[PDB]
């Protein structure tokens, strides 16, 4: 019945014997003497000079007596105050070229210092506010920011950090959730959240344990002071070889807790930032005191940022919907709606769509949300979602909300918004023997981190949504080397096979061998096809394509548009021209009759006829092998992109290479559909309708070089446009395309990697860059923020 000998014991005792572990307070299951022995606070956490060589008083939180080292309970500043040593922060950066660990240590430990709601811009505050953190940042490896997953809430982001998985895959899709299979709710408060049934994937503490690497308890009851959390970690580090964990985590509820009260830029935020830094100093001083300060890898990382949000900036569904009492809303910086058991999704979406001039939320069916959010493929995600404007909340009705009785809001800051929003970005710093010295790295998504942490511990990662190798540039030593996948399907290269006469495709028109087309239009090699299919490489003066005889359209179409390229028209005489392709059987070709019989569907072209190099070349653009099903509403988007925006990008970027193609993701799992999974065809045909259209736009990062003569790193932007039969998503869509199309595109920006998942292709296979560098490029997201 005693915690004597057991404080913060790693092997938690089962029921009903009392506990002394990190979480016993949250189970109200601590032994009676837990507070007394394990949560001592007398005299604080710092030695003072008058305590140096004191007689030991056992009531003290930490000790300054001469036996403190042998007892394992000196204050973190003991050697500094009592033995004349410097604080860690007062030492200059010193490159740790090799881990310097005690005997017995078989790998450098990892300590994750996680800070809740640590907005990326808080790093600008500087060495006068946060001297310790700024030393970590400038001596170690750091990114300008780290992007969280959506929703930009704590539990989804903490578990992503831990698993490398999107929320829809790990299952923690919100701080609040309903699961229809369990018929149960998950809430930050209450004990439900501890039940293993909610938690999917394989978190780092499980990965370590499964591979024979011990973890400290990552979780801490709120009542355990931060200083005690640190002392506990440090004390665990002095355990014998056969007990000592290799992986630890500190967690702090700051600066999030204050951020909500004062807003992210409230002047009161300086105090929490100072206190966090002091906690960091206690860790580093502690490690130095243990002579582990050149042994341990330390990651400083946040879960998300913080935005200015006040109760007066609240949209109410009751202003849009009658009978708002039929609905359940998960409210705040996002919306999820479901019925209470009158309810009808289409009525609800319509009634919420483009209804007020300044409307600060947009409704979506989850499958129509931007693919970059990867927020749909989980039964815990409601079909109806509201994306809320930064700085705003959505609520169901006024009386569902309440101010203080004094009339002021409960909060001035909040988070949860789209993870592209600047204010939601958080931090990453790595410091120690395995990280690079005084190195800055590009920003990266938090899904990538699990793989790094695995590498840092010599663990094989569980299957996750990180691209393993994409952050090899963070480390001075890599335990993992990325290898480029082998191509599964080889292309055919058909010459002239058929004759005009053999084609009865219902089309009308008013009437190539590699060469240097491959050199000019495919700058980074052919994409590889990573699934079993039959497809043809088709060459033309102005573009190259990979044409699928299964889906009867290109998988990809590649072409290069120079800065000085001329945009021309679709001649009147070629307005409705479609031409048979003599290289492809009639049987594996689309036909024009299908389109005439389909009253909703038209067609467009992947290579734009607007960017033809000559009148003769333009005829290639009307080949049946270049056409794709497009709703008329979609053609408004695509024609504007092709006729106006491609030239613009080319003009701005000193030329661009473009790869465009269809995506099919009818089951919204972010993966390429099998043919069995396609649920819509051009009527009377087996022409599959794309759910989306992608484009990858590449150029030289050094803009002084043209895109087709680039020596160094590359620059990419990409999108995955939803193929919709209306433009209800774009509230200004009844105006000229100049007012809304490019904003639609920006909303549906994507990583090359997202397109790879969605198509089963592999891009950038032949460049003068290292594969690791290419992995970084493929994980880049252009945000426009
Ligand atoms: C993000 O990462 C997760 C985890 O790797 C990915 O989920 C995994 O997806 C695979 C492939 O679909 C699933 O396994 C396979 O499922 C098919 C379909 O039934 C089956 O025929 C195969 O034999 C195999 O079991 C796997 O179950 C699933 N894992 C988890 C944890 O759900 C996910 O696809 C990734 N997301 C993106 C967008 O990349
Ligand atoms: C998810 N979570 C926490 N994640 C971290 C974390 C730290 C560093 C890092 F790189 C990645 C993650 C610390 S704690 C959480 C928190 C809030 C923070 C605290 N303390 N509170 C709790 C309570 C319970 C649990 C569960 C999660 C599920 N399991 S399981 C079944 O997967 O082993 C048990 C403990 N997590 N949790
Ligand atoms: Ca799919
Ligand atoms: Zn948080
Ligand atoms: Zn918060």
Residue 116 annotated as binding site: yes
E strands within 117-238? Answer: 141-147, 177-179, 184-186
Fold of 314-410: Gyrase A; domain 2 (3.30.1360)
C-alpha separations of 253 from 79, 298, 304, 449 in Å: 29, 19, 12, 20
Query: Of ligand 2's atoms, which has the minimum distance to the CA of residue 218?
Result: 13
Ramachandran category for residue 31: left, alpha or beta (phi over 0 → left; psi -120 to 50 → alpha): beta
Neighbours of 462 (CB within 10 A): 18
DSSP assignment letter at 188 = S
Which residues, 6 or more positions from 477, have their beta carbon under 8 angstroms from its beta carbon?
Answer: 434
Where do we find the tokens 């179409």? Answer: 557
Residue 154 annotated as binding site: yes
Domain locations in the chain as residue ranges: 86-95+108-307+423-474, 314-410, 500-779
Six token digits for residue 425: 């970005």
CATH class for the region spanning 86-95+108-307+423-474: alpha beta
Ligand closest to the CA atom of residue 164: 1
Bridge partner list, 699: 715
Protein residue with least CA distance to atom 2, ligand 2: 158
Where do we find the tokens 């080949």? Answer: 623
Same fold, 314-410 and 500-779: no
Instruction: Please report how the helices 226-236 and 270-289 are oriented relative to each other, as an axis angle in degrees rounded to 10.
Output: 20
Protein residue with least CA distance to atom 7, ligand 2: 249
Six token digits for residue 739: 């007012």
Strands 439-440 and 426-431: unpaired
**DSSP sequence for 736-768:** -GGGTHHHHHHHTEE-HHHHHHHH-EE---S-S
Which residues, 6 or more positions from 770, have their beta carbon under 8 angstroms from its beta carbon?
Answer: none
Q: Which of 737, 622, 635, 621 is nearest to 693 (CA)?
A: 635
Range 132-137, long-range pairs (CB < 8 A, 24+ positions): 132/88, 132/89, 132/277, 132/278, 132/280, 132/281, 132/284, 133/276, 133/277, 133/280, 133/300, 133/429, 135/88, 135/89, 135/93, 136/280, 136/284, 136/298, 136/300, 136/429, 136/431, 137/300, 137/429
Q: Resolution, in Å, please? A: 2.0
Range 325-332, long-range pairs (CB < 8 A, 24+ positions): 327/396, 329/394, 329/395, 329/396, 330/174, 330/176, 330/382, 331/393, 331/394, 331/395, 331/396, 331/400, 332/388, 332/393, 332/394, 332/395, 332/414, 332/416
Residue 465 annotated as binding site: no
Determination technique for this entry: X-ray
Residue 308's SS3 state is strand
Neighbours of 320 (CB within 10 A): 17
- How buried is residue 602: exposed, middle or buried, by Cβ count under 10 Å (0-12/13-18/19+)? middle
Six token digits for residue 442: 């590009």
Catalytic residues: 154
Residue 260 annotated as binding site: yes
CA dihedral 732, 733, 735, 739 (to 10 degrees): 70
The residue whose CB lies within 8 Å of the most ligand 1 atoms, and thus the one to mutate among 169, 672, 674, is 169
Query: Of ligand 2's atoms, which has the minimum distance to the CA of residue 453?
Result: 10
Which residues, 6 or more positions from 8, have their beta carbon under 8 angstroms from its beta carbon?
Answer: 20, 21, 22, 38, 217, 232, 235, 236
Domain 500-779 is found in CATH 3.40.570.10: yes
Q: Which of 154, 152, 116, 120 is nearest to 137 (CA)?
A: 120
- How buried is residue 689: exposed, middle or buried, by Cβ count under 10 Å (0-12/13-18/19+)? buried
Ramachandran category for residue 551: left, alpha or beta (phi over 0 → left; psi -120 to 50 → alpha): alpha
Rounded CA separation 85/322 (Å): 70
Rounded CA separation 491/536 (Å): 5
Neighbours of 492 (CB within 10 A): 14
DSSP assignment letter at 358 = T
Query: Does ligand 1 lie within 6 Å of residue 671's CB atom?
Result: yes
DSSP assignment letter at 641 = I
Protein residue with least CA distance to atom 10, ligand 1: 463
Query: Does ligand 1 lie within 6 Å of residue 464's CB atom?
Result: yes
Protein residue with least CA distance to atom 14, ligand 2: 219
602 contacts 632 by C-beta, under 8 angstroms: yes
- How buried is residue 661: exposed, middle or buried, by Cβ count under 10 Å (0-12/13-18/19+)? buried
Q: Which residues have C-beta atoms less than 6 Å from ligand 2?
A: 112, 114, 158-159, 161-162, 194, 196, 199, 203, 218-220, 249, 251
Rounded CA separation 302/390 (Å): 19
147 contacts 454 by C-beta, under 8 angstroms: no
Query: Of ligand 1's atoms, which has the minimum distance to the CA of residue 754?
Result: 38
Which residues, 6 or more positions from 234, have their beta carbon under 8 angstroms from its beta carbon?
Answer: 76, 283, 286, 287, 290
Instruction: Please report how the helices 270-289 and 131-139 are oriented relative to each other, as an axis angle in degrees rounded to 10.
Output: 60
b/e code 626-641 from CB counts within 10 Å (16+ = b): bbbbbbebbebbbbbb
Rounded CA separation 781/752 (Å): 8
**Torsional sign, CA 373, 429, 116, 119:** negative
């Amino acid at each position: 019945g005693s915690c004597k000998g057991r404080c913060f014991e790693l092997q938690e005792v089962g029921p009903p014997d009392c506990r002394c572990d990190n979480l016993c307070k949250s189970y109200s299951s601590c032994c009676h003497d837990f507070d007394e022995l394990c949560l001592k606070t007398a005299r604080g956490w710092e030695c003072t000079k008058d305590r140096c060589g004191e007689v030991r008083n056992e009531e003290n939180a930490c000790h300054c007596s001469e036996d403190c080292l042998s007892r394992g309970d000196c204050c973190t500043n003991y050697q500094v105050v009592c033995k004349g040593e410097s604080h860690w922060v007062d030492d200059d950066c010193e490159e740790i070229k090799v881990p310097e660990c005690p005997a017995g240590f078989v790998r450098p430990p990892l300590i994750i210092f996680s800070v809740d709601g640590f907005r990326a811009s808080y790093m600008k505050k500087g060495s006068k506010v946060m001297p310790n953190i700024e030393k970590l940042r400038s001596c170690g490896t750091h990114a300008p920011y780290m992007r969280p997953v959506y929703p930009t809430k704590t539990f989804p982001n903490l578990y992503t950090l831990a698993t490398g998985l999107y929320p829809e895959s790990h299952g923690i899709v919100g701080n609040s959730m309903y699961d229809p299979v369990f018929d149960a709710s998950f809430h930050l408060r209450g004990r439900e959240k501890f039940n293993h049934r909610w938690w999917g994937g394989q978190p780092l503490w499980i990965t370590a344990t499964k591979q024979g690497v011990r973890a400290g308890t990552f979780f801490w009851s709120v009542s355990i002071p931060h200083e005690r959390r640190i002392l506990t970690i440090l004390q665990w580090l002095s355990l014998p070889d056969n007990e000592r964990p290799s992986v630890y985590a500190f967690y702090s509820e700051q600066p999030d807790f204050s951020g909500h009260k004062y807003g992210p830029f409230g002047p009161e935020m300086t105090n929490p930032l100072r206190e966090i830094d002091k906690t960091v100093g206690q860790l580093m001083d502690g490690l130095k005191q243990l002579r582990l300060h050149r042994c341990v890898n330390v990651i400083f990382v946040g879960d998300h940022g913080m935005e200015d949000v006040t109760c007066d900036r609240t949209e109410f569904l009751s202003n849009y919907l009658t009978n708002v009492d039929d609905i359940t809303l998960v409210p705040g910086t996002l919306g999820r709606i479901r019925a209470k058991s009158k309810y009808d999704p289409k009525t609800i979406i319509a009634a919420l769509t483009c209804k007020k001039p300044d409307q600060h939320f947009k409704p979506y069916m989850k499958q129509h949300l931007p693919k970059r959010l990867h927020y749909a493929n989980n039964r815990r995600i409601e079909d109806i979602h509201l994306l809320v404007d930064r700085r705003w909340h959505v609520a169901r009705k006024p009386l569902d909300v309440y101010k203080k009785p004094s009339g002021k809001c409960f909060f001035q800051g909040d988070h949860g918004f789209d993870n592209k929003v600047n204010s939601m970005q958080t931090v990453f710093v790595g410091y120690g023997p395995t990280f690079k010295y005084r190195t800055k790295v590009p920003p990266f998504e938090n899904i990538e981190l699990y793989n790094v942490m695995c590498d840092l511990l010599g663990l094989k990662p569980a299957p996750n949504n990180g691209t393993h190798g994409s952050l090899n540039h963070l480390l001075r030593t890599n335990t993992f080397r990325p290898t480029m996948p082998d191509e599964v399907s080889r292309p055919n290269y058909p010459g002239i096979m058929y004759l005009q006469s053999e084609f009865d495709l219902g089309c009308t028109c008013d009437d190539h061998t590699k060469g240097s087309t491959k050199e000019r239009h495919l700058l980074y090699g052919r994409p590889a096809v990573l699934y079993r299919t039959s497809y043809d490489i088709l060459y033309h003066t102005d573009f190259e394509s990979g044409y699928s005889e299964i889906f009867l359209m290109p998988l990809w179409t590649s072409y290069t548009i120079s800065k000085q390229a001329e945009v021309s028209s679709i001649p009147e005489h070629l307005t409705n021209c479609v031409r048979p392709d003599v290289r492809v059987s009639p049987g594996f070709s689309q036909n024009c009759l299908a389109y005439k019989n389909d009253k909703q569907m038209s067609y467009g072209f992947l290579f734009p006829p607007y960017l033809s190099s000559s009148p003769e070349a333009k005829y290639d653009a009307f080949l049946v092998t270049n056409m794709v099903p497009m709703y008329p509403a979609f053609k408004r988007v695509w024609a504007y992109f092709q006729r106006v925006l491609v030239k613009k990008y080319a003009s701005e970027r000193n030329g661009v290479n473009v790869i465009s193609g269809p995506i099919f993701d009818y089951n919204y799992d972010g993966l390429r559909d099998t043919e069995d999974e396609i649920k819509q065809y051009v009527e009377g045909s087996s022409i599959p309708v794309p759910t989306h259209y992608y484009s990858i736009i590449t150029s030289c990062l050094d803009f002084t070089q043209p895109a087709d003569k680039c020596d160094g790193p590359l620059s990419v932007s990409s999108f995955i446009l939803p193929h919709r039969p209306d433009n209800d998503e774009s509230c200004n869509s009844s105006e000229d395309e100049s007012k809304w199309v490019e904003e639609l595109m920006k909303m549906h920006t994507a990583r090359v990697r997202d397109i790879e998942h969605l198509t089963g292709l592999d891009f950038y296979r032949k460049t003068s860059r290292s594969y690791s560098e290419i992995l970084t490029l493929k994980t880049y997201l252009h945000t426009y923020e």
